[model samples]
Target: SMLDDAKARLRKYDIGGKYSHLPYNKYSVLLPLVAKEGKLHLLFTVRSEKLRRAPGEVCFPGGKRDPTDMDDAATALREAQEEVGLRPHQVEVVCCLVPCLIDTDTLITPFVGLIDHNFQAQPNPAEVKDVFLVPLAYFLHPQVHDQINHIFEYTNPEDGVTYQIKGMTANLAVLVAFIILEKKPT
Candidate 1:
């Protein structure tokens, strides 16, 4: 019911290009979901240290929209496929959430999608360093008491490294949990 609930709510709430008149750089990220043990888990990616911009950061697999991309969802799917060999066919994109404007001149759209649970990401080492997953349930419980109740610190059990899940990724994750659980963190 959680997945179905998200599909409906997000589709209804999806704001498609409502702010396209505003001149700004457009970006999109796919919040990939993998069903495990009858629950959903979110896939995350670490930027390759070799990259000059935001290297070694924990975030979703995404980037700026390409000129050839048809839509925001296309860009998200293409980026995911290029970054982690996640074929577009492997994803069942539910819907796009409300786009958030980051910084001053960038609009970042978040797309929620369900991916194959057995997906072994072949990360392009040049652009992505690692790939991991965190349960949606884990994000439903927040530990910090910030103004927005965002969780900034997250330790990857796979690598034993504490990575800060901040910026748009953190906010989007919280938003997804809120939508699915229908409540904020307690």
Candidate 2:
């Protein structure tokens, strides 16, 4: 029931990948969803601290496209597999949200997909430091009163490490919540 709603509602908003053909650095990300306790949660990966770019940031498992990548989905799947060992076939591709270009002059395509609830993440130490899940409703109505320009800063309680939410990823997370819940964010 919960799964069907997300898949069907998100399908209606499928915009495909637009603006990916521009002469800019292209990237793709997998917005993975797992249904639990009659609710949906979004998966996230913390970038490895060793990486030079945006190390230890919270983001969907994805990356800059490879030269041989066939399409946005291909890049998304490949990177997910690399960073988290999430097999492409393991995810049920719900749909693609419209592509958006970020300040870094990179175009990002967000692929929303469903993963098995029991699937565990095997993060690649070179690319991912930790894997976590945040409830979709949390983004829909965050409980914070003081947001720094609407940016998300989630710190793991156990590790006490803060993972800054990348701009595009936060946008997509809220966007998905809006689309699925059919409600305005506060």
Candidate 3:
């Protein structure tokens, strides 16, 4: 039923936000997957050095939501296009994963997309400093996730609500796809 499950996820639907009343910013990122040398690989971008926040940090091709965007998927697609020159037709969106709450204020929704293996990348220097591919096998190894650090509760200055944040020492761009594939049919 994987084929049926795939079909169900392709259709349009709302990607719900986790913290509806958190009064914090929202963002979306695209997990771009492509086939390389008969193996799957994930594409990641290096944030531009000129950027004020997270400059030079490795990240997916996405950014803050624009008011004009229709939905989370739209925001992700538009940002991917702007940051990495990915056209809508070049990538097929698989599905959206549950929203990830970052430090209690920012919410980031990750959209998984299957990209053509031959697709070309033209990163925008203003936003993306560089782009690279990592083989899926690298993360399939167990040692990769050992870097994820667990933490205790902390108070949010915005609302004084205590929240526990799960900090990962390793990048989780591909983990989003792993989660989608690991889901069992209901």
Candidate 4:
């Protein structure tokens, strides 16, 4: 089933065709989760909209890969260190998911990790507006998903597909991916 899903998503995306014969630049992101009171919680950040790039984006704590990193995993941990002041050893990586392309120019590798419930976060004031905790139980409810709306826009002005999600209109590729993924079974 995982293979089937992977193939389907690939064909649906025409990923290979989009970026043929080109080297990729990668970034890593860790989705931190903690178990508390018999339930799982997600730790996330609300990035400052004042940032030079991707302002006002809801993103995991990370950044682009550097030349010195051993791999994407290291790139992720390293970036998290700088962005949120998280030590490289503080997180325990659970799994690395499929790498996705952001348009034709960039590829990103996203990783999922777990942190202790009592861990404290130190966020860079310039990058994050706030670091927050969200209970998974709230997301497990159908009401929350049902209340969300997906929104988007196309610049071509013709044959442009647009939609609304989670009560906001957005064009970010990952945002759409997340909306779709969140609605699926956990």
Candidate 5:
């Protein structure tokens, strides 16, 4: 009933977007989920404090696509292996979310993956400070959205055509919830 519950939480939400033909740097991140005892756990990592940008912020294991990478999925897998010691065989990629444009240039493509429950993490000390896991049921709890609020509207000037866009300012928890509900198994 987790899928149904996710559906209920996502009811009537328009999770749609238009693909742009603009040039941008490509990046990929994996939403690693682990099945353990009939429940699912989401994996996350805290960036190392030694890093200059976004230090100590929690995020999924991923990075920008390398020229040698075959695709977005490859980028995600390779990054995971480099950052958290996840072998390609230990994780199964399920689906991809719509590529989202960030900072008017980068196109970040996210992949949802099912990982082995017993998978060991050997995080790279230079890139990751720590790793943690959260249960899927935690996000399914009713009070999860109590603090989410709409922020404001903005537009990207890079593209010649501009459509008034609205953005919401919420915590990383809400963003993860959005990713889980909007891009659930299809």
Candidate 6:
């Protein structure tokens, strides 16, 4: 259902060209789902400090696009397979949504996928410190999205990059950008 919603939301936004002139790069986040306790769970990973960027952050299994990578979608899946020891043959991709660029100047593609409930992931220490799952219903709840008591908004002094929230560690700026910016359809 979230994949459908992502697809619908994508239809209304312009899939713009990358900022190639600024040495911009593309990455992807795979939103993997499986059934547990008769409920859907979201698979995610915590990056290790050994990573080049956003080290120690909670993220979906993903990485930077390679020169040989045909597209962002391919890059997403391939990175997912490589970083988390996930096999391409084992999972099914449902759909892909618009790429969201980070303030650090990296473009990110988010993929929604469905896989067998029994699928297991192995963490790669070079990138991932741990792998875990959370029930999707938690995110679907109105309270989870609307609750902002723990959120804190601030801008970095040097780079002037604005960051909000600290406790939950969810990147709230991504949500705000999507909400405040009026995306024009292509």
**How does residue 11 of candidate 4 score in lDDT?**
38
Query: Which 10 residues in a row give candidate 3 its minimum summed lDDT?
Result: 162-171
Instruction: Choose the strongest candidate by TM-score.
Output: 2
Q: For model 6, how big is the CA root-mean-square deviation?
A: 9.6
Name the regions of candidate 6 deviating beyond 4 angstroms: 1-24, 141-186
Q: What clash count goes with each model?
A: 0, 0, 0, 10, 0, 0
* CA lDDT scores, all candidates in order: 0.81, 0.83, 0.67, 0.55, 0.66, 0.59
Q: Give residue 126's lDDT in candidate 4 (0 to 100).
A: 83
Clashing pairs in 3: none
Alpha-carbon deviation at 148 in model 4, angstroms: 11
Is candidate 1 or 2 superior in lDDT?
Answer: 2
Q: Over the stretch 68-114, how does candidate 1's per-residue lDDT look in tens digits? A: 99888898999999999999778988877888887898988888988
Roughly what TM-score does model 3 have, to 2 decimal places? 0.70
Across 1-186, the per-residue lDDT of candidate 3 in tens digits comes to: 433454364433334444333566888888787776665666877789999987776677888888898877888999999998999999988777666778777888777788966689998999998777755555544332122563323333446644222233134543543543445544
How well does candidate 3 match the true structure, expressed as C-alpha RMSD? 10.2
Question: Each candidate's TM vs. the true structure?
Answer: 0.85, 0.86, 0.70, 0.63, 0.68, 0.64
Positional deviation of residue 12's Cα in model 5 after best superposition, in angstroms: 16
Q: Given candidate 4, what's the lDDT at residue 146?
A: 33
Model 5 scores worst on lDDT over the 10 consecutive residues at: 161-170
Candidate 5 to truth, TM: 0.68
Write candidate 5's Cα lDDT for 24-132 as tens digits: 7888888787765676667777789998877776677899888898767899999999999999999877656556677887987767677876798998999998776
Write model 2 residue lDDT over 1-186, tens digit each, in one string: 667877889999887755667788888889999887777888998889999988877889988899889888889999999999898668998899988867878778889999976678998998999899887877866633345666676655668766566477888998998888774343
Q: TM-score of the candidate numbered 2?
A: 0.86
lDDT of 3 at 177: 34
True-vs-predicted CA distance for residue 17, candidate 2, Å: 4.3
Q: Global CA lDDT of candidate 4, please?
A: 0.55
